[PDB]
UniProtKB/Swiss-Prot annotation:
Changing L32H: In sporadic cancers; somatic mutation. This is Cellular tumor antigen p53. Changing S85A: Abolishes strongly phosphorylation. Changing R148S: Does not induce SNAI1 degradation. Changing G144S: In sporadic cancers; somatic mutation. Changing N147I: In sporadic cancers; somatic mutation. Changing Q46P: In sporadic cancers; somatic mutation. Changing V120G: In sporadic cancers; somatic mutation. Changing N33D: In a sporadic cancer; somatic mutation. The chain holds residues 96 to 291 of 393 of the full protein. Changing E186V: In sporadic cancers; somatic mutation.
Amino acid sequence: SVPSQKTYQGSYGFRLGFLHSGSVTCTYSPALNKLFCQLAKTCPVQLWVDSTPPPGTRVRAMAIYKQSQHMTEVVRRCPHHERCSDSDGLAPPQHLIRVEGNLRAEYLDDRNTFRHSVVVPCEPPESDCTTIHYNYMCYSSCMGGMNRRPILTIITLEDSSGNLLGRDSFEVRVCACPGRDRRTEEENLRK
Ligand SMILES: *c1nc(F)c(C#N)cc1F
Ligand SMILES: *c1nc(F)c(C#N)cc1F
Ligand SMILES: *c1nc(F)c(C#N)cc1F
Ligand SMILES: *c1nc(F)c(C#N)cc1F
Ligand SMILES: [Zn+2]
Protein backbone atom coordinates (compact mmCIF):
# COMPACT_ATOMS: atom_id res chain seq x y z
CA SER A 1 0.00 0.00 0.00
CA VAL A 2 1.22 3.51 -0.89
CA PRO A 3 -0.29 6.74 0.49
CA SER A 4 -1.31 9.22 -2.20
CA GLN A 5 0.88 12.30 -2.60
CA LYS A 6 -1.41 14.19 -4.99
CA THR A 7 -1.76 17.86 -4.05
CA TYR A 8 -5.41 18.66 -3.25
CA GLN A 9 -6.52 22.04 -1.93
CA GLY A 10 -10.04 20.74 -1.35
CA SER A 11 -13.08 22.73 -0.25
CA TYR A 12 -11.16 24.75 2.34
CA GLY A 13 -8.30 25.74 0.04
CA PHE A 14 -5.68 23.94 2.10
CA ARG A 15 -1.97 24.44 1.37
CA LEU A 16 1.39 24.63 3.14
CA GLY A 17 3.85 27.46 3.21
CA PHE A 18 7.34 28.21 4.41
CA LEU A 19 8.85 31.43 5.65
CA HIS A 20 12.11 32.65 4.12
CA SER A 21 15.54 31.42 5.17
CA GLY A 22 18.97 31.39 3.55
CA SER A 23 24.32 28.49 10.60
CA VAL A 24 20.77 27.58 9.50
CA THR A 25 19.20 24.54 11.10
CA CYS A 26 16.44 24.39 8.49
CA THR A 27 15.85 25.90 5.10
CA TYR A 28 13.22 25.40 2.43
CA SER A 29 13.90 25.47 -1.31
CA PRO A 30 10.80 26.44 -3.37
CA ALA A 31 12.63 25.55 -6.60
CA LEU A 32 13.09 21.96 -5.38
CA ASN A 33 9.98 21.89 -3.08
CA LYS A 34 12.46 20.51 -0.59
CA LEU A 35 13.09 21.11 3.10
CA PHE A 36 16.69 20.72 4.33
CA CYS A 37 17.06 20.38 8.09
CA GLN A 38 19.37 19.23 10.86
CA LEU A 39 18.58 16.25 13.07
CA ALA A 40 15.90 16.91 15.72
CA LYS A 41 15.70 20.65 15.10
CA THR A 42 12.48 22.67 14.83
CA CYS A 43 10.99 22.82 11.32
CA PRO A 44 8.15 25.40 11.26
CA VAL A 45 5.55 24.66 8.59
CA GLN A 46 2.75 27.11 7.90
CA LEU A 47 -0.77 25.93 7.10
CA TRP A 48 -3.24 28.02 5.12
CA VAL A 49 -6.93 27.62 4.42
CA ASP A 50 -9.26 29.90 2.51
CA SER A 51 -12.17 28.98 4.80
CA THR A 52 -12.28 27.72 8.35
CA PRO A 53 -12.79 23.92 8.47
CA PRO A 54 -15.21 22.31 11.00
CA PRO A 55 -14.30 21.65 14.66
CA GLY A 56 -12.60 18.28 14.88
CA THR A 57 -10.57 18.79 11.71
CA ARG A 58 -7.02 17.47 12.14
CA VAL A 59 -3.63 17.72 10.38
CA ARG A 60 -1.56 14.59 9.85
CA ALA A 61 2.09 14.25 8.77
CA MET A 62 3.46 11.05 7.22
CA ALA A 63 6.80 10.25 5.56
CA ILE A 64 7.08 8.05 2.46
CA TYR A 65 10.07 7.22 0.27
CA LYS A 66 10.12 9.38 -2.85
CA GLN A 67 11.56 6.76 -5.23
CA SER A 68 8.99 4.37 -6.67
CA GLN A 69 11.09 1.28 -5.95
CA HIS A 70 11.04 2.07 -2.21
CA MET A 71 7.51 3.46 -1.86
CA THR A 72 6.04 0.37 -0.17
CA GLU A 73 8.74 0.43 2.53
CA VAL A 74 7.65 2.03 5.81
CA VAL A 75 9.77 5.06 6.72
CA ARG A 76 11.03 4.56 10.26
CA ARG A 77 13.91 5.55 12.50
CA CYS A 78 17.10 3.55 12.03
CA PRO A 79 18.19 0.84 14.55
CA HIS A 80 20.58 3.33 16.20
CA HIS A 81 18.28 6.29 16.72
CA GLU A 82 15.24 4.23 17.77
CA ARG A 83 17.31 3.16 20.80
CA CYS A 84 18.13 6.75 21.80
CA SER A 85 16.78 7.88 25.15
CA ASP A 86 15.19 10.91 23.52
CA SER A 87 11.48 10.36 24.20
CA ASP A 88 9.38 13.46 24.70
CA GLY A 89 6.88 11.34 26.63
CA LEU A 90 4.56 11.12 23.64
CA ALA A 91 6.35 10.09 20.45
CA PRO A 92 7.06 6.36 20.15
CA PRO A 93 10.79 5.81 19.60
CA GLN A 94 10.35 4.39 16.07
CA HIS A 95 8.68 7.47 14.59
CA LEU A 96 10.75 9.66 12.28
CA ILE A 97 8.46 12.71 12.47
CA ARG A 98 7.50 14.35 15.77
CA VAL A 99 5.41 17.41 16.53
CA GLU A 100 6.92 19.59 19.18
CA GLY A 101 5.14 21.97 21.50
CA ASN A 102 1.67 20.43 21.10
CA LEU A 103 0.31 18.34 23.97
CA ARG A 104 -2.59 17.15 21.76
CA ALA A 105 -0.32 15.40 19.26
CA GLU A 106 -1.29 11.77 18.68
CA TYR A 107 0.99 9.17 17.12
CA LEU A 108 -0.47 6.38 14.97
CA ASP A 109 0.99 2.99 14.07
CA ASP A 110 -1.46 1.92 11.38
CA ARG A 111 -2.80 -1.55 12.16
CA ASN A 112 -3.10 -2.46 8.47
CA THR A 113 -0.36 -0.60 6.60
CA PHE A 114 2.15 -0.33 9.52
CA ARG A 115 2.86 3.28 8.57
CA HIS A 116 3.62 5.90 11.20
CA SER A 117 2.03 9.32 11.37
CA VAL A 118 1.55 12.17 13.80
CA VAL A 119 -1.69 14.14 13.94
CA VAL A 120 -2.79 17.31 15.78
CA PRO A 121 -6.14 19.13 15.95
CA CYS A 122 -6.40 21.92 13.43
CA GLU A 123 -6.92 25.26 15.14
CA PRO A 124 -7.82 28.70 13.66
CA PRO A 125 -4.97 31.24 13.36
CA GLU A 126 -4.16 33.80 16.08
CA SER A 127 -2.63 36.20 12.27
CA ASP A 128 -3.38 34.76 8.83
CA CYS A 129 -1.48 31.44 9.24
CA THR A 130 -1.27 28.44 11.52
CA THR A 131 2.19 27.04 12.30
CA ILE A 132 3.10 23.45 13.22
CA HIS A 133 6.62 22.61 14.44
CA TYR A 134 7.97 19.31 13.15
CA ASN A 135 11.16 17.43 14.10
CA TYR A 136 12.89 14.78 12.01
CA MET A 137 14.58 12.24 14.27
CA CYS A 138 16.96 10.48 11.82
CA TYR A 139 19.44 11.58 9.19
CA SER A 140 18.65 10.81 5.56
CA SER A 141 21.96 8.95 5.49
CA CYS A 142 21.24 6.60 8.46
CA MET A 143 22.04 3.04 7.49
CA GLY A 144 19.30 0.57 8.32
CA GLY A 145 16.83 3.45 8.12
CA MET A 146 16.50 5.94 5.27
CA ASN A 147 19.95 4.87 3.97
CA ARG A 148 20.42 7.99 1.76
CA ARG A 149 17.00 7.56 0.13
CA PRO A 150 14.94 10.74 -0.36
CA ILE A 151 11.62 11.04 1.44
CA LEU A 152 8.47 13.11 1.09
CA THR A 153 6.45 14.44 3.98
CA ILE A 154 2.75 14.32 3.15
CA ILE A 155 0.57 16.73 5.12
CA THR A 156 -3.14 15.88 5.07
CA LEU A 157 -6.04 17.91 6.35
CA GLU A 158 -8.61 15.39 7.64
CA ASP A 159 -12.06 15.36 9.16
CA SER A 160 -12.76 13.74 12.52
CA SER A 161 -13.11 10.29 10.86
CA GLY A 162 -9.82 10.61 9.00
CA ASN A 163 -11.41 11.32 5.62
CA LEU A 164 -9.34 13.45 3.26
CA LEU A 165 -10.06 17.20 3.12
CA GLY A 166 -6.79 18.46 1.67
CA ARG A 167 -3.25 17.40 0.94
CA ASP A 168 0.13 18.96 0.23
CA SER A 169 3.69 17.66 0.41
CA PHE A 170 7.40 18.46 0.31
CA GLU A 171 10.65 16.53 -0.01
CA VAL A 172 12.93 16.40 3.06
CA ARG A 173 16.66 15.94 3.46
CA VAL A 174 17.84 15.57 7.05
CA CYS A 175 21.52 16.43 7.06
CA ALA A 176 24.33 18.08 9.04
CA CYS A 177 24.69 21.10 6.70
CA PRO A 178 21.24 22.11 5.36
CA GLY A 179 22.29 25.48 3.91
CA ARG A 180 25.21 24.03 1.96
CA ASP A 181 23.20 21.05 0.71
CA ARG A 182 20.39 23.35 -0.47
CA ARG A 183 22.86 25.49 -2.42
CA THR A 184 24.44 22.37 -3.98
CA GLU A 185 21.12 20.87 -5.08
CA GLU A 186 19.82 24.20 -6.44
CA GLU A 187 23.04 24.58 -8.41
CA ASN A 188 22.56 21.08 -9.87
CA LEU A 189 19.01 22.01 -10.91
CA ARG A 190 20.42 25.15 -12.55
CA LYS A 191 23.06 23.13 -14.46
C1 LIG B 1 13.65 26.42 9.30
N1 LIG B 1 13.29 26.08 8.06
C2 LIG B 1 12.46 26.88 7.40
F1 LIG B 1 12.12 26.49 6.16
C3 LIG B 1 11.96 28.08 7.97
C4 LIG B 1 11.04 28.89 7.23
N2 LIG B 1 10.27 29.51 6.66
C5 LIG B 1 12.35 28.42 9.26
C6 LIG B 1 13.21 27.58 9.91
F2 LIG B 1 13.64 27.85 11.17
C1 LIG C 1 20.72 9.02 20.51
N1 LIG C 1 20.44 9.40 21.77
C2 LIG C 1 21.34 10.14 22.43
F1 LIG C 1 21.03 10.51 23.68
C3 LIG C 1 22.56 10.54 21.86
C4 LIG C 1 23.47 11.34 22.63
N2 LIG C 1 24.23 11.94 23.27
C5 LIG C 1 22.84 10.14 20.55
C6 LIG C 1 21.90 9.37 19.89
F2 LIG C 1 22.14 8.96 18.62
C1 LIG D 1 -6.53 24.35 10.56
N1 LIG D 1 -7.64 24.59 11.26
C2 LIG D 1 -8.22 25.79 11.12
F1 LIG D 1 -9.34 26.01 11.83
C3 LIG D 1 -7.72 26.78 10.27
C4 LIG D 1 -8.44 28.02 10.14
N2 LIG D 1 -8.98 29.04 10.08
C5 LIG D 1 -6.56 26.50 9.55
C6 LIG D 1 -5.98 25.27 9.70
F2 LIG D 1 -4.85 24.96 9.02
C1 LIG E 1 0.21 31.96 5.89
N1 LIG E 1 0.37 30.64 5.85
C2 LIG E 1 0.38 30.04 4.66
F1 LIG E 1 0.53 28.71 4.65
C3 LIG E 1 0.22 30.75 3.46
C4 LIG E 1 0.23 30.00 2.23
N2 LIG E 1 0.19 29.41 1.25
C5 LIG E 1 0.04 32.13 3.51
C6 LIG E 1 0.04 32.71 4.76
F2 LIG E 1 -0.13 34.03 4.88
ZN1 LIG F 1 19.13 7.28 12.41
